Design a protein around this ligand. Structure first.
Ligand code: VJJ
Ligand code: ZN
Length: 258
């Protein structure tokens, strides 16, 4: 498969190899704040990242992933809309070429500069590959980034990007604390959806925080110096690696807050 974000291999093309691209629960979506309803039934959200064990950071030619040890319940997401326990496996971002675009989810059609995806899998299914075959297999915590003040807890990420410039490069990335990427409030919207990259599987409970984090222009500029290409190939800057909003179809977005 040779998908990407360009004219010739971008999101409009994905449905030919991945027909679920035109499915009934695709992500991202626009979150219309005047149609999402507060749901008093939602339990409190629980982000338990104290024992998180980061391992490595990888440029996969589409984004970069920070990878965690998920062989036990070290960093887990529970509560909110979720039943049971979801283990953190990795995070990554989507970002733009300019500060006015980059997020995947939008808020009243507003695009943020970037969006962070913290990807977790349901432990009742034993492993990630089994979990993605289930409608409740994953929970992705989505966090918007806006440009303003620097985010200190991001800086160790931006500083390692020089070492994974091109597709296929990885670097050791131990002792990174994903708590430093969270906003103050855990107020969220939730809806059922999908992976936003091929294979676009419809296995995700999305939990999108209302409060963005601020990052500096210098920080996001360094994201934009990555490369989609491999070493010794012509340079294609890793920018605009976001899928646009997909049809909501027969889905309701619920708010955790009034
Ligand atoms: O779009 C994402 O957030 C995402 C996150 C993790 C993995 C992933 O892609 C695969 C999932 C299962 C099998 C092969 C690839 C996509
Ligand atoms: Zn993502």
């Amino acid at each position: 498969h040779h998908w990407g974000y360009g004219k010739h291999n971008g999101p409009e093309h994905w449905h030919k190899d991945f027909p679920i691209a035109k499915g009934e629960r695709q992500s991202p979506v626009d979150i219309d704040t005047h149609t999402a309803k507060y749901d008093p039934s939602l339990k409190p959200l629980s982000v338990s990242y104290d024992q998180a064990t980061s391992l490595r950071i990888l440029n996969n030619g589409h984004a970069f992933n920070v990878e965690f040890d998920d062989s036990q319940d070290k960093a887990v997401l529970k509560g909110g809309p979720l039943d049971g326990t979801y283990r953190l496996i990795q995070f990554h971002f989507h970002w733009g070429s300019l500060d006015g675009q980059g997020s995947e989810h939008t808020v009243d059609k507003k695009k943020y500069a970037a969006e962070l995806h913290l990807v977790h899998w349901n432990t009742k299914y034993g492993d990630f590959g089994k979990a993605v075959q289930q409608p409740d297999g994953l929970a992705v915590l989505g966090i918007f980034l806006k440009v303003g003040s620097a985010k200190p807890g991001l800086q160790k990420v931006v500083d390692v990007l020089d070492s994974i410039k091109t597709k296929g490069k990885s670097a050791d990335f131990t002792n990174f604390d994903p708590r430093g990427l969270l906003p103050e409030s855990l107020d969220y919207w939730t809806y059922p959806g999908s992976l936003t990259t091929p294979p676009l599987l419809e296995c995700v409970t999305w939990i999108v925080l209302k409060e963005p984090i601020s990052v500096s222009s210098e920080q996001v500029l360094k994201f934009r110096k990555l490369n989609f290409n491999g070493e010794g190939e012509p340079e294609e800057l890793m920018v605009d690696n976001w899928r646009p909003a997909q049809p909501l179809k027969n889905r309701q977005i619920k708010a955790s807050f009034k």
